[PDB]
Write a protein that binds this ligand. Sequence first.
Ligand SMILES: *[C@@H]1O[C@H](CO)[C@@H](O[C@@H]2O[C@H](CO)[C@@H](O[C@@H]3O[C@H](CO[C@H]4O[C@H](CO)[C@@H](O)[C@H](O[C@H]5O[C@H](CO)[C@@H](O)[C@H](O)[C@@H]5O)[C@@H]4O)[C@@H](O)[C@H](O[C@H]4O[C@H](CO)[C@@H](O)[C@H](O)[C@@H]4O[C@H]4O[C@H](CO)[C@@H](O)[C@H](O)[C@@H]4O[C@H]4O[C@H](CO)[C@@H](O)[C@H](O)[C@@H]4O)[C@@H]3O)[C@H](O)[C@H]2NC(C)=O)[C@H](O)[C@H]1NC(C)=O
Ligand SMILES: CC(=O)N[C@@H]1[C@@H](O)[C@H](O)[C@@H](CO)O[C@@H]1CP(=O)(O)OP(=O)(O)OC/C=C(/C)CC/C=C(/C)CC/C=C(/C)CCC=C(C)C
Lengths: 120, 29, 34, 644
Amino acid sequence: AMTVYALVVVSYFLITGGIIYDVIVEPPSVGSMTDEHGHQRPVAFLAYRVNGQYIMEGLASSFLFTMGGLGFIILDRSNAPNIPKLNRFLLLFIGFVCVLLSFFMARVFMRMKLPGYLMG
Amino acid sequence: VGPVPVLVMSLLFIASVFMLHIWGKYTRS
Amino acid sequence: MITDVQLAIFANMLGVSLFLLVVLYHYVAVNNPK
Amino acid sequence: MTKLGFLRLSYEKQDTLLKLLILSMAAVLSFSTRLFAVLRFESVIHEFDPYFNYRTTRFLAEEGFYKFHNWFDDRAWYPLGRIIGGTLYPGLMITSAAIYHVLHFFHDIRNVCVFLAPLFSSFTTIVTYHLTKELKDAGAGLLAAAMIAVVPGYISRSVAGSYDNEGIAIFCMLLTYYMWIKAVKTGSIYWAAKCALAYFYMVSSWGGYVFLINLIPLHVLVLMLTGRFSHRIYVAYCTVYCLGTILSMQISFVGFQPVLSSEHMAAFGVFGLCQIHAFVDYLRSKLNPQQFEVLFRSVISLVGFVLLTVGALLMLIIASVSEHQPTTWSSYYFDLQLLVFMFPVGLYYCFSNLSDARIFIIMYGVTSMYFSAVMVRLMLVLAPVMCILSGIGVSQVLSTYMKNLDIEVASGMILVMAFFLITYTFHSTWVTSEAYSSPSIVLSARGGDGSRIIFDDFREAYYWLRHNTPEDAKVMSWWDYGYQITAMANRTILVDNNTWNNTHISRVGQAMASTEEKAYEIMRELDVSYVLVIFGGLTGYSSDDINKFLWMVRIGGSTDTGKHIKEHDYYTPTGEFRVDREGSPVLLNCLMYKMCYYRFGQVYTEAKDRVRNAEIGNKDFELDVLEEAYTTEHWLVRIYKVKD
Ligand SMILES: *[C@@H]1O[C@H](CO)[C@@H](O[C@@H]2O[C@H](CO)[C@@H](O[C@@H]3O[C@H](CO[C@H]4O[C@H](CO)[C@@H](O)[C@H](O[C@H]5O[C@H](CO)[C@@H](O)[C@H](O)[C@@H]5O)[C@@H]4O)[C@@H](O)[C@H](O[C@H]4O[C@H](CO)[C@@H](O)[C@H](O)[C@@H]4O[C@H]4O[C@H](CO)[C@@H](O)[C@H](O)[C@@H]4O[C@H]4O[C@H](CO)[C@@H](O)[C@H](O)[C@@H]4O)[C@@H]3O)[C@H](O)[C@H]2NC(C)=O)[C@H](O)[C@H]1NC(C)=O
Ligand SMILES: CC(=O)N[C@@H]1[C@@H](O)[C@H](O)[C@@H](CO)O[C@@H]1CP(=O)(O)OP(=O)(O)OC/C=C(/C)CC/C=C(/C)CC/C=C(/C)CCC=C(C)C
């Protein structure tokens, strides 16, 4: 059934996110040492070592991934057929899903560049 | 809302908050 | 012998040629009937 | 000139003109891409792993010959030794020695273990096309073949300079799916015999077939519950099962194991239940659904369950190595950029048009996701999976959206997918240059901007061992450098990586111990001539036996004194690590703080050893039981003239 697909996409970001860092769990975001004045500002996603993450890093990554895929699901399931409201609902659907697609890929590109320092 | 600027107006307000929040935090660390 | 960066630009243009030409295949395959 | 281009007889012929065009220059890409890791620096072998393979590789073309010669060595593992009873898989080696049976007859041995992997990639990117023809389309694979041609992590673990034991296991595995999936789709049993004969090539090389028979029958188990049996599942499945078991039975690593281990034993139980359920379907379809089929249904069920009871009664440093630890999205999306995004897409399409063949790939998309959740080294198993379904996914999205127009949404949706996807091939071009274009035996250093220091202490020291040492010798340092010492040195050794005898490795921890009087006695037990250790102190990011020293510290076996208690000394006595003057004094009397350190108070200044950011100041020059054998060029390895 399609509920099995629901189960799998549920499992998707669940084991993209943090099952690897369930036992190696590293707490969410604080690592600044006063930087000049202000003591313990929580920093970010980890950047210097590549393999590590925190809980807050992983969840964000997983969320970015499944929304993109299910945006393509929405492109398939409704935008290619022609049955519903042919000027109001459809245009919304392609609009927000194209927004999903473009801004999602853009921000994930940003969230690999800034933790990664890769030449873009 | 004959016009959509009221929304855009709200977005401008958030940006003013958004940008002006980190804008003073620029000189700090 | 060719260098590293020359090979990098080589791989870039080859991959671009490749994927665009995939799209061209996919057009010719979708258009012309069975 | 010659304007007859796009009016040739396309979809029949110019179809194939474009087909074989992509099957040329896409396959160019995989082999070409691997190359700049060895074009940039090396000539022969990057990692430490291909040395132990390369030695026996050139052996089994020099003198050994597998059908008439397996082989024994005393050169490794003094005094125990290891032989082709271990090292699962000559499928690398027989491949390489076959290639320079042939091409050497056509006329080198350098160029056969280093050029091989690019070759593997090229071949694999053409077998993935003939695979993916069978799934959606020939059009589905023509973007999919490029995907495994330049998925950079699959490039990364098999680069130009790789010769890993799983270096061509992937090709076999992929091939066995071409050799399974139109046997399932068409029960052609000559062709399924060709399938099992191909399976033997995988079941040689790398132990992922313990994975594969975790995969293939339990997939079949899925086809119980979805109920989509036929003959043409069954008639193809019995062949590669039962004949494949005997072809595994030929091999020693899996030996009489295909009788006994908990995975493929349950796979055998699944084969038995499958062949019963085929037979059950055959009978009882000539008879009615009477009462009496329920009666001997009870009879045959009780005989089957008592078979289940008789079966259930009778049931007969690696973690530390940084890569076997679990990985996040960096191995992920850093690994597999656009091709993560498209992974559910075709999978949705595979749950849209859920055909008979595609459910196997869906199970293969589940399982390898679950397994590359824990080992990034196992990431290679998910290396083509993603490229399969994303290969479907784009070829769904593209097909549906060049559908609509030429026969404004498609004036975006086609138009994004170029720059959406080809940014991928930017990433694949260059992440391959960043992380993975660096060997294990030659370390790139820092310090200048023009003609900067980027320099070969391993070949300097190992080639000292290959000139100025006796023939019969000792090599003992630590196990993860065990093959390379057998690369160029031709020197007899005690330990090595694998780890089939754990006790033999555990008394090397008492050879790298606290008490020099007992450690040197354990040395004198084990026929010493030479000892090695590696530094990393004054540039940091190199390894060695001082940061896997915690591993040595807690290694414990056949011991009662010292190595019993995991602390031993090494903490500040509240329980925190220090090594220096503020460190701990039995560590000062341990080996590795004096084993390594001689005359280092006298050479560097300004309070360094960048690994610890340590200090000069210990007297620390006390060779109670040894002498120096190599005063170093770049503090690299102090070779130990083992003194009486
Ligand atoms: C992986 O690597 C591992 C490390 O490299 C390797 O492990 C090693 O494996 C070898 C092979 O088995 C082990 O050697 C044996 O160890 C036995 C352990 O005995 C312990 O307990 C005894 C008391 O119960 C102690 O006596 C004994 O030694 C102590 O005393 C020594 C002298 O004072 C001293 O040097 C020791 O350090 C220690 O203090 C130890 O503590 C040991 O019993 C055994 O000795 C017999 O075998 C030797 C030949 O193999 C003979 O030289 C020796 O004299 C003994 O011979 C007996 O057995 C022979 C047949 O086996 C007979 O022919 C002999 O006549 C004699 O038989 C008498 O005794 C029998 C009962 O045992 C009886 O049936 C007979 O009728 C007769 O009365 C041997 O040394 C080694 O210990 C392992 N080391 C470690 C660290 O684990 C492992 O094998 C590798 N893995 C693989 C798969 O290969
Ligand atoms: C050069 C060298 O050292 N070779 C040795 C080799 O000779 C030796 O036999 C071997 C063992 O010592 O190790 C050296 C070579 P290797 O490291 O590549 O072998 P290895 O350690 O066995 O590697 C193991 C990798 C695998 C891919 C095997 C399977 C791993 C598993 C965790 C089991 C999975 C279970 C399944 C049902 C499969 C499907 C997956 C699901 C359902 C999640």
